[model samples]
Target: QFTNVSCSASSQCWPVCKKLFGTYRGKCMNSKCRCYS
Candidate 1:
C-alpha cells in the first residue's frame, strides 16, 4: 500500500514500513514517507 506521511528522515520510515506495510523497502522523499513491498 502506498500512502503519504510527514517524514524528515528514512530512519523512522523504513523500520515502521517493514512492520506496518510488510515491506523491506521504503524511504523518505521530499519530507514524505513512501513504502514499497
Candidate 2:
C-alpha cells in the first residue's frame, strides 16, 4: 500500500502515486513520467 504520496512538481506535471488502503492497488493519472501501481 502507498502512503503520503506526492508529486515533486508544484504544477502536478510529474507523476504522483495514489495512496491505497489494505491490498488495494494505487494509481497515477495525468503524469508526464512513469507511475507505478
Candidate 3:
C-alpha cells in the first residue's frame, strides 16, 4: 500500500517508503517537490 509520501533531494529521486512502501517517487531538486499522501 502507498505510504510515507514525501519529497526528497537525495541525489536520486526516491519514493517515500514507509512500512516498506511509498506513495510514489518523483524527480525533486532545489524546488519544493511536494508529494501528497
Choose the strongest candidate by lDDT.
1
**Candidate with best TM-score:** 1
For model 3, residues 1-37, the per-residue Cα lDDT tens digits are 3223344563233443322335444445454343334
- Superposition error at 30 for model 3 (Å): 7.9
Give a tens-digit lDDT track for model 1, residues 1-37.
5446777788888876787798857788788777888
Superior by TM-score: candidate 2 or candidate 3: 3
User: Per model, how many backbone clashes are there?
Assistant: 0, 0, 0
Q: What is the lDDT, from 0 to 100, of the residue 11 in candidate 3? A: 29
lDDT per prediction?
0.75, 0.33, 0.38
Measured against the true structure, the TM-scores of the candidates, in listed sequence, are 0.61, 0.19, 0.21
**Candidate 3 TM-score, true structure as reference:** 0.21
